Design an enzyme around this catalytic site. Structure first.
Site, PDB file in Angstrom:
ATOM      1  N   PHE A   1       0.804  -1.213   0.000  1.00 45.35           N
ATOM      2  CA  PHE A   1       0.000   0.000   0.000  1.00 45.35           C
ATOM      3  C   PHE A   1       0.843   1.272   0.000  1.00 45.35           C
ATOM      4  O   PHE A   1       0.440   2.287   0.568  1.00 45.35           O
ATOM      5  CB  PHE A   1      -0.967  -0.018   1.181  1.00 45.35           C
ATOM      6  CG  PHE A   1      -1.788  -1.273   1.262  1.00 45.35           C
ATOM      7  CD1 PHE A   1      -2.816  -1.499   0.363  1.00 45.35           C
ATOM      8  CD2 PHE A   1      -1.529  -2.230   2.225  1.00 45.35           C
ATOM      9  CE1 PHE A   1      -3.572  -2.649   0.430  1.00 45.35           C
ATOM     10  CE2 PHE A   1      -2.283  -3.383   2.295  1.00 45.35           C
ATOM     11  CZ  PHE A   1      -3.304  -3.594   1.397  1.00 45.35           C
TER      12      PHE A   1
ATOM     13  N   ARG B   1      13.460  -2.877   6.429  1.00 42.11           N
ATOM     14  CA  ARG B   1      14.142  -1.733   5.819  1.00 42.11           C
ATOM     15  C   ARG B   1      15.294  -1.199   6.665  1.00 42.11           C
ATOM     16  O   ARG B   1      16.075  -0.384   6.179  1.00 42.11           O
ATOM     17  CB  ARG B   1      13.121  -0.627   5.534  1.00 42.11           C
ATOM     18  CG  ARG B   1      12.002  -1.095   4.615  1.00 42.11           C
ATOM     19  CD  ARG B   1      10.895  -0.070   4.527  1.00 42.11           C
ATOM     20  NE  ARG B   1       9.910  -0.398   3.505  1.00 42.11           N
ATOM     21  CZ  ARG B   1       8.865   0.363   3.208  1.00 42.11           C
ATOM     22  NH1 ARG B   1       8.371   1.228   4.078  1.00 42.11           N
ATOM     23  NH2 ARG B   1       8.304   0.254   2.008  1.00 42.11           N
TER      24      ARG B   1
ATOM     25  N   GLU C   1       1.219  -3.174   6.049  1.00 42.60           N
ATOM     26  CA  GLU C   1       1.815  -3.187   4.713  1.00 42.60           C
ATOM     27  C   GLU C   1       1.945  -1.778   4.133  1.00 42.60           C
ATOM     28  O   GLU C   1       1.340  -1.435   3.116  1.00 42.60           O
ATOM     29  CB  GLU C   1       1.020  -4.094   3.771  1.00 42.60           C
ATOM     30  CG  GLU C   1       1.632  -5.457   3.592  1.00 42.60           C
ATOM     31  CD  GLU C   1       1.302  -6.069   2.257  1.00 42.60           C
ATOM     32  OE1 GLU C   1       0.407  -5.537   1.568  1.00 42.60           O
ATOM     33  OE2 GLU C   1       1.950  -7.073   1.894  1.00 42.60           O
ATOM     34  N   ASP C   2       2.764  -0.966   4.802  1.00 42.79           N
ATOM     35  CA  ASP C   2       3.078   0.391   4.362  1.00 42.79           C
ATOM     36  C   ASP C   2       1.807   1.232   4.245  1.00 42.79           C
ATOM     37  O   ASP C   2       1.485   1.789   3.196  1.00 42.79           O
ATOM     38  CB  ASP C   2       3.853   0.373   3.041  1.00 42.79           C
ATOM     39  CG  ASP C   2       5.183  -0.328   3.162  1.00 42.79           C
ATOM     40  OD1 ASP C   2       5.704  -0.418   4.293  1.00 42.79           O
ATOM     41  OD2 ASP C   2       5.711  -0.793   2.129  1.00 42.79           O
ATOM     42  N   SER C   3       1.075   1.294   5.352  1.00 46.87           N
ATOM     43  CA  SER C   3      -0.111   2.128   5.448  1.00 46.87           C
ATOM     44  C   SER C   3      -0.070   2.870   6.773  1.00 46.87           C
ATOM     45  O   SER C   3       0.529   2.404   7.744  1.00 46.87           O
ATOM     46  CB  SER C   3      -1.394   1.300   5.332  1.00 46.87           C
ATOM     47  OG  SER C   3      -2.491   2.121   4.979  1.00 46.87           O
TER      48      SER C   3
END
Ligand SMILES: [Mg+2]
Ligand SMILES: [Zn+2]
Ligand SMILES: [Zn+2]
Ligand SMILES: [Zn+2]
Ligand SMILES: [Zn+2]
Ligand SMILES: [Zn+2]
Lengths: 92, 556, 115, 46, 484, 82, 117, 260, 67
Positions: B142, E285, E112-114
RNA sequence: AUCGAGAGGA
C-alpha cells in the site's frame, strides 16, 4: 441482416491476383488523381474516393449507404504503369 | 492479443482487515459509473422498476434501459415517464451493487493468482479495499499501488468467474502444491504472541473476541482454569477458531534440534511442537511455519480437508479475532529494541578486533611470501578468499551474539520468530555489525590508483579500506563505510532495474511456446496441431493443486 | 469526491430505525441488538453493565466496520430471563449511575468553589 | 457594465470593452487582472 | 582527529583534509536526518521522494501561473535538522509538518506500508493543502476563413454546444475570480466563425471532478499581438484515505484509515498520535535513523531546541538522546504507556511514540481514481480511448489474456477482448472469403469478385481483426475467411 | 459411437460445471421453466445451483474426443464433484 | 548431450538442469510443469529452442506465429505458399474474436428436449 | 445486577482545567465519559463564512477554516440554541445561530494584525475566548497597505464527533492504577519507567505487587478547556449528554419491544 | 505560512502565542523558557511553536494587486 | 485529436 451468422473454421491465405483486385475494387479505372479533394467536395477518382467509403460522420457511403459504423471500408486499386517488385516477396 | 476494455476501473489500494478474503471494497463513484445488464424477469420486475425510477442520480439506480428491439433509453437526463416503463424482454444496466462478481488484477500479471474473483462491498471513501491475506498472491502493498477491477457484463461470464477464479478456490497453487495465501505481518505476530503458553483471557475479553468469530456455535468453552479465577487460554480460542476436525503436527521456529531426541518430546518445555487434534490446538506456538504459505501448514490442511469456503472463513476469522486481541496486547518497535547490553557490546568489540588482527596476520603473511596458494586458485584468490572467510566468520559470530543478547520482550525477535518480517541478518546488522560491502561478488574495487578512497594508503587490503562496515546501523557508519554501503545499494538497484526485461522476455517466450497445450478428453495432453506430448498429464494424470508431499515407507 | 458527510455518523437516515431486535437460533435465550449511529461510547458501557448481571450468560459488542456507523450487541441470559429485559435493566442502571455521578460532581464542584 | 480590469503594475482601475486594445492608460502595461466577482459564495469552516 | 599522533602510525604524511564529511551528500540527501543509520536504498528512495514533497515551492506563488502547483497550509521546519539544510534554505521553505508518530499495530489498518492519520488533526489543518491549476487560451486570427473571439456563446447561434452551463461568464467570455466551478464547467467562452450558424463553440471546460474555485484570471496580449488569457482555479485538498505520505527515511505509505481523537490511543497526558505506522516496516528496511529521529524529536520538543542530525558526528549519539529524554520525565528509549481509545484499557506492550518529520507526497488518490463504462473510442480502431483524462479504459494486455487462458475462462476472455472492447460484424463471401459489399437497408449483398448475391454469410469479429485483414489485403495478402 | 460404452470420465469437470451453470442461468433469466421448487429464490445463479444440486438440468454435454468423435452426457448422468 | 546420446537423453538432461536452476535457491516447482516444458522442447525429435527460430519453425499456424514473432515475415510465407489455418489453436480464435477451445470452450452444450418435461 | 455507586474527588479546579478522581466505577464508564468529553459536548463554532472581500495572502478557504477554529463563549447559550437540523426556521435564525462580522482595512504603513478582536457578534454572550475580560488574541491574518478583509460568519451548534472545532477540550488526561497493580501493562524492565504523578511508592520499588482479584478503579482526570466552556461545565454537559443518549436508546428499545 | 490556531494533537490554542513567543525570544529568553512562560507544557504544542516558520511576513513584501 | 520527447508511480 439476413445473411446467416456463421463462424470461420478455416482461414486460407494467398496472394491477391491482379484480376481479382481489379474485379473487386469499387473504383472503376483505378486512382489517377493524386490530390485528396477539390473545393471541399471529394474527387471522384482521387484518394478521397466517395465510393471507397464514408468521409465524415452523418454521411453515407456511395457503394453501400452505410454510416460511420455500419460501413466497412471498400477496397480500391491502382493500375501501375509497369510491373513492380514486391519487397515482402523479394526473397520469394 | 491485448486491448483497452470497457467496464474497468483503477484506484489506489488500501488495507481492510474487516473484509473477507473474497471481498473487495469499491468506492461508490466507481459503482455509480459502472453498470451491469440484467434481463427483466417477473421475479425481479419490481426491483428493476425501483432502480429505473431511482435513476442515474442516486447511486442505487441505473442509466440505461435496453429494449428488446434494440434502442437504448438513457435515464441520465430527462427520463420520460412514457418510456420509463419496462417489460420482460427488456434489460436495464443497473449500477454495481454489493455481491457483484468482479475480477481483481495487479500488474504485472505473473501467475494465474494475479487475477482473482472478488465480491463487491461498497465503502464510503475512494480506494480499493483488500483483505491483507489476499495480498501475497497479488504481490501487492500500500505504498501507492493500484489495481484494475474488471466487471463482467454477462451472466455466463459471471458464473464462470464465480466457479473458477474465486479467491477461496485460488488458495492452493498447482505451481508448487502449496497455499498462495496465509497469515501476514500483524496477524502473524499477534498469533505468535496469542498462542503462547502464558496467555490468559478474562471473561469479558473472551466474549469480545468471540463476537468476531463467524463460525461460532454460541457456546462458551469451559475455561482452562476454573479456580481461583476463570481464565481461557489463547490456544483454546484458536482451537475454537480452527474449522472442522483437521489434524496437524508442525514445528515452531525456536524448536531445539535435541528436543525430539531426549525426554519431554511430547511435553515441550518451550511450547513448540504444534499439535492440532479434532480441530483443537492441543499445544504449540504458531508462526509462519504453521499459518503461512508452506506446504502442509494449517491452512493447507484445512483446504485439503474442508472446502474453499471453510478455509476462507478460517482466514477471515483468524485475521479478525487476533486483530481484536492485538487491540488489547499491542506491538511496537523502537530504539530500545536496537540496544544490546554492555557485555554484548564488549563481545561484539572482541569479535571485531580479533578479526582485524587476523586480517593483519594474513596481510603480513602475504607480504612475507608465506601464503602457499590452495589448489585451483591464484595467490590473490587464496588471500582474498581467506580474508573474506575470516570477516564472514566474525560477522556470523557477532550476529549470534546479538541473537543471544536479545530478550523475550524484544520486538525485533518477536517479528522474526513469528516470521512476519525481518531476519537474523537484519537483527545482526541493526545491533552488531552491518558487514562486508561487496561489488560484483568481490570487495570494493580500487577505483583510484591502487586506492578505494583517497583517505587510505596505496595497496591497503585491510577490512576498512576494502569495505568492511565495522559499525552497526544503530551506532552509525563512518563516511567511508557510508560510501561503500551506497555502492552496495546502487548495485542492488542496478540488478533490480536490469533483470526485469530479460525475465519478462523469458516469460513471454515460455507462454508463447506452451500456450495451446491442453489436456484432452481422452486424458491425453495435445497441442493445437493435435500432436500428443504426454499420454497422461504429468505422466500420472493428476492436477497440481491436489497432490502433497509424502514419505515412502519401504525405500529407506 | 466520495467523502461521506460529517454528520452521517450520528444522524439517522429517514426510514432507518435506531435499534433492531433479532433472535439468535444457534443458542436459546439469545438475541442480537443492532444499533445504528452508535459506537464504542455506548457499546462498551452497555456490554460492561450487562456483564455485571449474574443472569446474563453472554454479553459482547462489536463494530462490523469502522467506516459503517452501526454496532451489534449480543446478549444471552438465563432460561428464566430475557435479553430484552437484560438490555433494559442495564440501560436503566447506567442512567441511575450517571445521575448519581452528575449530582455528586455538582456537589463537589460547589464545595470546591465555596471552600 | 464598465467591466473594469486592474493593472498589474500600477493597479489602476481602468475600464475596457470588447474590440478594444488590451492596454493600461496610466502606465501602458499590457497585463491586467479581472476584478473579484460580487456573487455570494459560501464557505463552510471545515 | 586523523592528524593526531597515535600509538601506531597509519599515514603520518597527510597532504589535505576534508572540511566536513557530510559534504559528499547532495540537496535531497542532506534533508535526511541521521543518514548513516539507514540502509542505502532507503536513502535513495528518500532522495527521490523529497522532490515529491509538498510545501511552498516559491514565495511569489501568488503571481506564478504554473500549470500545476500544490501548496501546503502549515509547513514546519523539522525539529531534527541537518546543518546543510541551513544553506539549502529548507528551513525558510519547508515541505512537511512535525507529526506525533506512534509506531504501533492499531486495528490492523496500518499494515503493509499504510498509515493511520488522526482525523481531528486533519480537521485542524494537519497536512491540508491547496491545488492550483492554470488554463491558457488565446484567440487566433491567422486567417479570415476561421477566426476566434472571446464571447459568451448562446444556444441560438453556436453549434458545438455541450450540456454544461454557460451562465458563469461575463459578457467578455471570461469567468471572474471567486466563482465555484464544478466539473465540466465553462470558464472561457470562445466562438470561431463558421465557414448553430456562423459561429462554432470552442470553449474551454474545467477539468473533470474538480469542484474548485477560480482564484484569479489574467488577460494580456501574446507575441503575435492577440488576446491571451490565463485562468487559475484553486481547489483545497484535505488529506484523506489513499493519500501518500512519507518520512525522511524512505518510509512511504497511504492513509489506511482516519480515526477521531477519541478513537486514537493516548498517553497518560492526552497525547493522541497524529500518525500511526506499522512496526513491520522497520526490520525489513532497517531504518534505524527513523527511530533515532523520533527520539531526538521528543528530546528537542521537550528541551525547546532544534536537534542536530548531521550524518557523521560523534558529539551526539542515541544514548545521549536517551539520557536527555530520561531527564524530562520520559522513558529513556522513547516508549510510552498508551491507552486504547475504544475501551480505555492500557495497551500491554508499551508503544514507541514521538515527533517525526513527515511529508505529504503529491500523490493524491483524487487524481488516480478512474472508471469507464462505454465512453469514447479511438478513430483508427473502435477500441476504448487511453488515459483517465480522455475517459479511456484499462488495457487487458497479453499477460492478462495469458492468465485468463490458464484459468480457462473462454467466455470471459471473449467478453474482454471482443464483446466489451470492439464488437463488430461483417459480411463475407462464402466462396472467395473476402468481405462483401452488403447493404443493410435494402438487403442486397454483392461480391464484385465472384459476382454472387446468395453465397454471402455474416461473421462477427473484432474491428481490430477487420483492420488487420484489410491491412494484409493492402499488402497483397489475401486472407480468405472460409466458414464452410 | 455406441451409447452402450463411453471412455470419458464420469465426473463433471469444473469448466463443464461453470458453463452449464452460466448457460442455465441465462436461460432462466430469459424466462425458461424451472425444474426445482423455488422456495424464495429470485436470482438465476442460485436457481441454477439448486437445479444442479437436484440433478435436473436440461443440458447435454457434447464431449469432443480428439479423434473427431463425440460422447453426449446428460448433466444428471455426471457425478458432481462440488 | 543431444548429439552424443539422443533426444530422450537430452530430455532427461534438460529436466535435470532446469531443476538444478530452479531448486538451487531452495524454491520448489511441481514436476509436471517442468516435464511438460521438456517434452514440448523435445517431442518433435530435435531440440526446439524457446525462440522464434524454434517455435515459428513448427507447423502450428501462421496466425499463431504472427502473434508470437516475425509477423510480416510469417504472413508473407503463408501468402506465398497458400497455407491455411485450421483454427484449432487458442490465439487464432482470440484473434478472430471467437470462443477459444480452452477450458469452458473445449466442449459443446445441447438442449435436452426429453428432460424439459 | 445493579449499577455502581461512584464517588468524585476534585483535587484541582482552575479557570483552565479541572482535576478530579472518580472512584468506584467501571473502566467502560470512565472511558465513555472521556470519549464524550472529547466528542459529544455541544459548543458554538463558526460554520458559515461569506467573504465579501479578501485581498490578503491567504485564500478564502484558509481564512474561513482559521475563523472556524476560533473558539467562542458557549457556557450558557449552547443549551438555548438548537441544531439547524432540528430548527424549523429558515437557513439561519437567532435561535439556531450566532451572527458575526469582520471589516478591517490596513491603511497605515505598519503591518495590520487581524486578530479575534475584529470578530463582532450580535450575541453579547457569544464572543471569542481571548476577547473575554494575559493571553493575547488569536491571529487570523496579516494585512499590509491596501489589503482588506470583509466577511460575514455564522456560529452553529455541534460536537467534536462532527468536526474537531466543536471539541471543547485541550487535552483529557486519563489514567488508572498509577502503580501497575493489575499488570495491565507488562514492563520488560520496570525500573526504567518513571513514577506516575499519582504514584504512591518508595524509590526502591517500581510497581505495586500483583493484585489477582482487582479491577480498574480510581480513575484520574485532567480536563483542559479550550475556553468554550469551563471544565466543570464540560464534565456536567458530557454526563448529561451520555445520560440523554442512553435515554433515547432506552426509548427506542421500548418501542421495538412493544412492536414485537 | 501563518501560525495555526490550534495544536494538531490536542487542540489547545497556539494562534495567540506567536507574537509573545517572538517578544520573549528578543527578550533574551531561551526557546524552552519562552515555551514554559507561555504555558506550553505538552511537547506537541512545544513543537507547534518551535518548528513554525512564518511565511506570511515574506508574502507581505509583495505589493497588493488591487489598490 | 495525431506524433515525438521528457519527467515520474507501483
Ligand atoms: Mg507498492
Ligand atoms: Zn461503404
Ligand atoms: Zn498600469
Ligand atoms: Zn466472393
Ligand atoms: Zn433557526
Ligand atoms: Zn498540543
Amino acid at each position: 441482416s439476413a445473411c446467416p451468422l456463421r463462424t470461420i473454421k478455416r482461414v486460407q491465405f494467398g496472394v491477391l491476383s491482379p484480376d481479382e483486385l481489379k474485379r473487386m475494387s469499387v473504383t472503376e479505372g483505378g486512382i489517377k488523381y493524386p490530390e485528396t479533394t477539390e473545393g471541399g467536395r471529394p474527387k471522384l477518382g482521387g484518394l478521397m474516393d466517395p465510393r471507397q467509403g464514408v468521409i465524415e460522420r452523418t454521411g453515407r457511403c456511395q457503394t453501400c449507404a452505410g454510416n460511420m459504423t455500419e460501413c466497412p471500408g471498400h477496397f480500391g486499386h491502382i493500375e501501375l504503369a509497369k510491373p513492380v517488385f514486391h519487397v515482402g516477396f523479394l526473397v520469394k | 492479443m491485448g486491448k483497452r476494455v470497457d467496464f474497468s476501473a483503477r484506484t489506489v489500494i488500501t488495507p481492510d482487515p474487516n473484509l473477507s478474503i473474497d471481498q473487495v471494497g469499491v468506492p461508490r463513484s466507481i459503482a455509480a459509473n459502472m453498470t451491469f445488464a440484467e434481463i427483466v424477469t417477473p421475479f425481479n420486475i419490481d426491483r428493476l422498476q425501483e432502480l429505473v425510477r431511482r435513476g442515474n442520480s442516486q447511486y442505487p439506480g441505473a442509466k440505461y434501459i435496453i429494449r428488446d428491439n434494440g434502442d437504448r433509453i438513457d435515464l441520465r437526463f430527462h427520463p420520460k415517464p412514457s418510456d420509463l416503463h419496462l417489460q420482460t424482454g427488456y434489460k436495464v444496466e443497473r449500477h454495481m451493487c454489493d455481491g457483484d462478481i468482479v475480477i481483481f488484477n495487479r500488474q504485472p500479471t505473473l501467475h494465474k493468482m494475479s487475477m482473482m474473483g472478488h465480491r463487491v462491498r461498497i465503502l464510503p471513501w475512494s480506494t480499493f479495499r483488500l483483505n491483507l491475506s489476499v495480498t501475497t498472491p497479488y504481490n501487492a502493498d500500500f505504498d501507492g499501488d493500484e489495481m484494475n477491477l474488471h466487471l463482467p457484463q454477462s451472466l455466463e461470464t459471471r458464473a464462470e468467474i464465480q466457479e473458477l477464479a474465486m479467491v477461496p478456490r485460488m488458495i492452493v497453487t498447482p505451481q508448487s502444491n502449496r497455499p498462495v495465501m496465509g497469515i501476514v505481518q500483524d496477524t502473524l505476530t499477534a498469533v505468535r504472541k496469542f498462542t503462547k503458553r502464558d496467555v490468559f483471557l478474562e471473561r469479558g475479553e473472551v466474549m469480545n473476541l468471540l463476537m468476531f468469530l463467524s463460525t461460532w456455535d454460541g457456546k462458551v468453552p469451559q475455561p482452562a482454569i476454573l479456580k481461583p479465577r476463570p481464565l481461557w487460554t489463547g490456544k483454546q480460542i484458536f482451537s475454537l477458531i480452527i474449522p472442522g476436525h483437521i489434524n496437524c503436527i508442525r514445528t515452531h521456529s525456536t524448536h531445539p534440534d535435541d528436543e525430539d531426541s531426549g525426554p519431554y518430546k511430547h511435553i515441550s518445555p518451550g511450547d513448540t511442537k504444534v499439535v492440532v487434534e479434532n480441530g483443537e490446538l492441543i499445544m504449540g506456538i504458531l508462526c509462519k511455519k504453521s499459518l503461512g504459505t508452506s506446504a502442509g501448514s494449517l491452512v493447507h490442511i484445512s483446504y485439503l480437508e474442508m472446502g474453499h469456503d471453510i478455509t476462507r472463513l478460517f482466514y477471515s476469522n483468524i485475521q479478525t479475532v487476533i486483530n481484536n486481541w492485538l487491540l488489547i496486547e499491542g506491538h511496537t518497535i523502537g530504539i530500545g529494541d536496537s540496544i544490546a547490553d554492555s557485555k554484548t557490546y564488549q563481545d561484539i568489540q572482541n569479535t571485531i578486533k580479533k578479526a582485524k588482527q587476523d586480517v593483519i596476520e594474513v596481510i603480513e603473511k602475504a607480504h612475507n611470501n608465506e601464503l602457499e596458494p590452495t589448489p585451483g586458485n591464484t595467490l590473490r584468490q587464496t588471500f582474498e578468499n581467506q580474508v573474506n572467510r575470516i570477516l564472514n566468520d566474525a560477522r556470523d559470530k557477532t550476529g549470534s551474539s546479538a541473537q543471544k543478547s536479545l530478550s523475550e520482550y524484544n520486538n525485533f525477535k518477536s517479528m522474526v520468530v513469528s516470521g512476519a518480517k525481518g531476519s537474523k541478518i537484519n537483527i545482526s546488522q541493526v545491533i552488531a555489525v552491518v558487514g562486508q560491502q561487496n561489488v560484483e561478488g568481490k570487495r570494493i574495487p580500487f577505483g583510484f590508483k591502487h586506492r578505494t578512497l583517497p583517505h587510505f594508503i596505496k595497496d591497503d587490503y585491510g577490512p576498512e579500506s576494502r569495505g568492511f562496515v565495522e559499525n552497526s546501523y544503530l551506532a552509525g557508519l563512518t563516511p567511508t563505510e557510508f560510501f561503500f554501503h551506497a555502492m552496495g545499494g546502487r548495485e542492488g538497484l542496478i540488478d533490480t532495474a536490469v533483470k526485469t526485461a530479460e525475465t519478462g522476455y523469458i516469460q513471454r517466450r515460455l507462454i508463447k511456446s506452451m500456450e495451446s497445450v491442453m489436456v484432452k478428453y481422452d486424458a491425453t495432453v495435445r497441442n493445437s496441431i493435435n500432436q500428443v506430448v504426454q499420454l497422461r498429464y504429468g505422466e500420472d494424470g493428476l492436477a497440481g493443486e491436489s497432490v502433497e508431499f509424502q514419505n515412502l515407507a519401504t525405500l529407506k | 469526491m466520495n467523502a461521506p458527510p460529517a454528520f452521517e455518523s450520528f444522524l439517522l437516515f429517514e426510514g432507518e430505525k435506531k435499534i433492531t431486535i433479532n433472535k439468535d437460533t444457534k443458542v436459546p435465550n439469545a438475541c442480537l441488538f443492532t444499533i445504528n449511529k452508535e459506537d464504542h461510547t455506548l457499546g462498551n458501557i452497555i456490554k460492561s453493565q450487562l456483564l455485571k448481571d449474574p443472569q446474563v450468560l453472554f454479553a459482547g459488542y462489536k463494530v462490523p466496520h469502522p467506516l459503517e456507523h452501526k454496532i451489534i450487541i449480543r446478549v444471552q441470559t438465563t432460561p428464566d430471563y430475557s435479553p430484552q429485559e437484560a438490555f433494559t435493566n442495564a440501560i436503566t442502571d447506567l442512567i441511575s449511575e450517571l445521575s448519581l455521578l452528575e449530582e455528586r460532581f455538582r456537589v463537589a464542584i460547589k464545595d470546591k468553589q465555596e471552600g | 457594465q464598465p467591466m473594469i480590469y486592474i493593472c498589474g503594475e500600477c493597479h489602476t482601475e481602468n475600464e475596457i470593452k470588447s474590440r478594444d486594445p488590451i492596454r493600461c492608460r496610466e502606465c501602458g502595461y499590457r497585463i491586467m487582472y479581472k476584478k473579484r466577482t460580487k456573487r455570494l459564495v459560501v464557505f463552510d469552516a471545515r | 582527529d586523523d592528524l593526531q599522533e597515535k600509538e601506531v602510525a597509519y599515514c603520518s604524511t597527510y597532504t589535505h583534509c576534508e572540511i566536513h564529511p557530510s559534504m559528499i551528500l547532495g540537496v535531497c540527501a542532506s534533508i535526511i536526518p541521521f543518514p548513516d543509520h539507514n540502509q542505502s536504498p532507503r536513502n535513495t528512495y528518500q532522495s527521490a521522494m523529497g522532490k515529491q514533497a509538498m510545501g511552498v515551492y516559491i514565495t511569489n506563488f501568488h503571481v506564478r501561473m504554473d500549470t500545476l502547483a500544490h501548496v501546503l497550509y502549515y509547513p514546519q521546519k523539522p525539529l531534527v535538522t541537518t546543518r546543510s539544510m541551513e544553506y539549502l534554505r529548507f528551513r525558510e521553505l519547508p515541505a512537511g509538518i512535525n507529526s506525533i508518530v506512534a509506531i504501533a499495530s492499531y486495528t490492523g489498518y496500518n499494515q503493509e506500508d499504510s498509515v493511520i492519520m488522526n482525523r481531528s488533526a486533519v480537521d485542524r489543518g494537519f497536512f491540508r493543502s491547496v491545488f492550483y491549476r492554470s488554463y491558457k487560451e488565446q484567440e487566433s486570427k491567422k486567417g479570415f476563413d476561421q477566426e476566434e473571439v472571446f464571447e459568451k456563446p448562446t444556444r441560438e447561434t453556436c453549434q458545438g454546444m455541450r450540456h454544461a452551463i454557460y451562465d458563469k461568464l461575463d459578457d467578455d467570455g471570461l469567468i471572474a475570480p471567486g466563482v465555484r466551478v464544478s466539473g465540466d464547467d465553462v470558464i472561457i467562452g470562445k466562438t470561431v466563425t463558421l465557414p448553430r450558424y456562423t459561429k462554432r463553440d470552442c470553449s474551454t471546460f474545467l477539468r473533470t471532478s474538480e469542484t474548485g474555485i477560480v482564484d484569479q484570471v489574467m488577460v494580456t496580449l501574446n507575441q503575435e499581438g492577440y488576446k491571451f488569457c490565463k485562468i487559475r482555479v484553486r481547489s483545497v485538498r484535505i488529506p484523506q484515505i489513499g493519500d501518500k505520505f512519507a518520512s525522511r527515511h524512505g518510509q512511504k505509505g497511504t492513509c489506511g484509515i482516519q480515526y477521531r481523537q477519541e478513537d486514537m490511543p493516548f498517553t497518560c497526558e492526552g497525547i493522541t498520535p497524529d500518525i500511526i505506522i506499522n512496526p513491520h516496516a522497520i526490520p525489513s528496511r532497517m531504518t534505524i535513523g527513523h527511530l533515532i529521529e523520533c527520539l531526538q524529536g521528543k528530546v528537542s520538543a521537550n528541551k525547546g531546541e532544534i536537534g542536530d542530525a548531521t550524518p557523521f558526528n560523534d558529539a551526539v549519539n542515541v544514548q545521549k538522546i536517551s539520557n536527555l529524554l530520561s531527564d524530562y520525565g520520559y522513558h529513556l528509549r522513547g516508549n510510552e504507556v498508551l491507552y486504547n481509545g475504544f475501551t480505555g484499557r492500557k495497551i500491554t506492550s508499551q508503544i514507541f511514540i514521538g515527533p517525526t518529520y513527515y511529508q505529504r507526497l503529491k500523490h493524491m488518490v483524487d487524481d488516480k481514481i478512474h472508471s469507464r463504462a462505454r465512453g469514447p473510442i479511438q478513430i483508427l480502431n473502435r477500441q476504448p480511448m487511453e488515459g483517465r483524462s480522455r475517459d479511456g479504459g484499462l488495457r487487458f494486455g497479453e499477460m492478462e489474456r495469458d492468465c485468463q487462458i490458464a484459468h480457462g475462462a473462454a467466455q470471459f476472455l471473449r467478453e474482454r477482448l471482443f464483446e466489451a472492447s470492439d464488437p463488430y460484424q461483417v459480411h463475407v463471401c462464402n466462396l472467395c472469403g473476402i468481405m462483401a459489399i452488403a447493404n443493410t437497408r435494402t438487403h442486397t449483398y454483392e461480391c464484385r469478385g465472384c459476382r454472387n448475391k446468395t453465397q454471402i454469410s455474416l461473421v462477427r469479429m473484432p474491428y481490430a481483426c477487420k483492420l488487420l485483414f484489410q491491412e494484409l489485403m493492402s499488402m497483397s495478402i489475401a486472407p480468405r475467411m472460409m466458414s464452410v | 459411437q455406441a451409447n452402450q460404452k463411453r471412455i470419458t470420465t464420469p465426473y463433471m469437470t469444473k469448466y463443464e460445471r461453470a458453463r452449464v451453470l452460466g448457460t442455465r442461468a441465462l436461460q432462466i433469466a430469459m424466462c425458461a421453466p424451472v425444474m426445482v421448487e423455488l422456495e424464495g429464490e429470485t436470482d438465476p445463479l442460485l436457481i441454477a445451483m439448486k437445479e444442479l444440486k437436484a440433478r435436473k438440468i436440461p443440458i447435454i454435454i457434447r464431449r469432443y474426443l480428439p479423434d473427431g468423435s463425440y460422447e453426449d452426457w446428460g448433466v444428471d448422468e455426471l457425478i458432481i464433484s462440488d | 548431450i543431444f548429439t552424443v546420446l539422443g533426444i530422450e537423453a537430452v530430455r532427461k538432461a534438460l529436466e535435470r538442469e532446469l531443476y538444478h536452476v530452479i531448486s538451487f535457491d531452495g524454491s520448489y516447482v511441481n514436476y509436471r510443469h517442468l516435464a511438460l516444458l521438456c517434452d514440448t522442447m523435445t517431442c518433435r525429435g530435435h531440440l526446439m529452442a524457446i525462440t522464434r527460430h524454434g517455435v515459428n519453425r513448427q507447423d502450428t499456424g501462421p496466425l499463431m506465429k504472427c502473434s508470437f514473432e516475425e509477423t510480416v515475415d510469417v504472413l508473407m510465407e503463408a501468402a506465398a505458399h497458400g497455407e491455411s489455418d485450421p483454427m484449432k489453436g487458442v490465439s487464432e480464435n482470440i484473434m478472430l474474436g471467437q470462443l477459444a477451445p480452452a477450458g469452458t470452450g473445449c466442449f459443446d452444450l445441447l438442449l435436452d428436449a426429453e428432460k424439459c418435461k | 445486577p445493579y449499577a455502581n455507586q461512584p464517588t468524585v474527588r476534585i483535587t484541582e479546579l482552575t479557570d483552565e482545567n479541572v482535576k478530579f478522581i472518580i472512584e468506584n466505577t467501571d473502566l467502560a464508564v470512565a472511558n465513555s465519559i472521556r470519549r464524550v468529553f472529547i466528542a459529544e459536548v455541544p459548543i458554538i463554532a463558526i460554520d458559515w463564512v461569506q467573504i465579501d472581500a479578501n485581498s490578503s495572502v491567504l485564500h478564502d478557504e484558509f481564512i474561513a477554516h482559521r475563523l472556524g477554529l476560533i473558539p467562542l463563549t458557549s457556557d450558557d447559550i449552547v443549551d438555548k440554541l438548537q441544531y439547524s437540523r432540528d430548527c424549523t426556521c429558515e437557513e439561519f435564525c437567532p435561535e439556531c445561530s450566532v451572527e458575526f462580522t469582520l471589516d478591517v482595512r490596513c491603511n497605515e504603513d505598519q503591518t495590520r494584525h487581524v486578530t479575534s478582536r475584529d470578530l463582532i457578534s450580535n450575541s453579547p454572550r457569544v464572543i471569542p475566548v481571548t476577547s473575554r475580560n494575559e493571553q493575547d488574541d488569536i491571529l487570523i491574518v496579516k494585512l499590509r497597505k491596501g489589503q482588506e478583509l470583509r466577511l460575514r460568519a455564522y456560529a452553529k451548534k455541534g460536537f467534536g464527533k462532527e468536526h474537531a472545532k466543536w471539541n471543547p477540550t485541550a487535552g483529557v488526561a486519563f489514567e488508572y492504577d498509577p502503580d501497575n497493580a493489575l499488570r495491565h501493562t507488562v514492563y520488560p524492565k520496570p525500573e526504567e519507567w518513571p513514577k506516575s504523578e499519582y504514584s504512591e511508592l518508595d524509590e526502591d520499588e517500581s510497581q505495586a505487587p500483583y493484585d489477582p482479584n482487582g479491577k480498574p478503579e480510581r480513575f484520574y482526570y485532567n480536563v483542559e478547556s479550550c475556553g468554550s466552556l469551563r471544565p466543570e461545565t464540560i464534565v456536567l454537559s458530557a454526563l448529561s449528554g451520555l445520560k440523554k443518549k442512553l435515554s433515547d436508546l432506552q426509548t427506542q428499545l421500548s418501542h421495538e419491544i412493544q412492536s414485537d | 505560512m501563518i501560525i495555526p490556531v490550534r495544536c494538531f494533537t490536542c487542540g489547545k490554542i497556539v494562534g495567540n502565542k506567536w507574537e509573545a513567543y517572538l517578544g520573549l525570544l528578543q527578550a533574551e529568553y531561551t526557546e524552552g523558557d519562552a515555551l514554559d512562560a507561555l504555558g506550553l507544557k505538552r511537547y506537541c504544542c512545544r513543537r507547534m511553536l518551535l518548528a513554525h516558520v512564518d511565511l506570511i511576513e515574506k508574502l507581505l513584501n509583495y505589493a497588493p494587486l488591487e489598490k
